Homo-oligomer: A and B are copies of this chain.
Amino acid sequence: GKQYIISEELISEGKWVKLEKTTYMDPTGKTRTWESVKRTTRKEQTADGVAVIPVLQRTLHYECIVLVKQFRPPMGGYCIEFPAGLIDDGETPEAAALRELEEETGYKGDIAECSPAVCMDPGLSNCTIHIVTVTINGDDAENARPKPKPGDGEFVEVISLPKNDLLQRLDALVAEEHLTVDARVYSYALALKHAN
């Protein structure tokens, strides 16, 4: 009944990603194969990366979610995402969240909560992240004029949409700008509307 991995064979390994053929035992006692994807960068970390839900709080204003718009070569187009990135060797999820947030948007934030490791596309890959909810005090002088510090090859546009109408604003962006919205962002947006 219980399924498990028998063995993994490397098909192709690049600098960043690899393709494996996975042999596994199905519930009926029959062994099957599966073409799996993995990052090559995972080490002693609980997950590959962090995604940050940055809630920007200014008084006398709506709460905003801070998103980033980037060109994504795999997608061959621009995407709207939660700020995200790899957890560095020895770095905690919480710390990687704040750093990524500051690198991509400039905002200095405070941890609110940190998810367990969640899978990005379990049908395709073993990639996991921690989803980290961060509040940004946008009345602090820190965040008055936020200063992005992007690394080499990081071209990032910051986009702050209101929480209270996030789903509609995202759909407007897709129709207007012909962007692709991230699935995690859209799931979040949906739930806000579906809450009772």
Contacts and interface: CB of A to CB of B under 8 A. Distances in A.
Interface in A101-131: 115-129, 131
A39 interface: yes
A127 B118 contact: no
Interface string A2-23: 0111000001101111110110
B186 A123 contact: no
Report the interface size class on chain A.
35 or more
Contacts of A79: 119, 122
B37 A71 contact: no
A139 interface: no
Contact of A118 (B51, B120, B182): B182
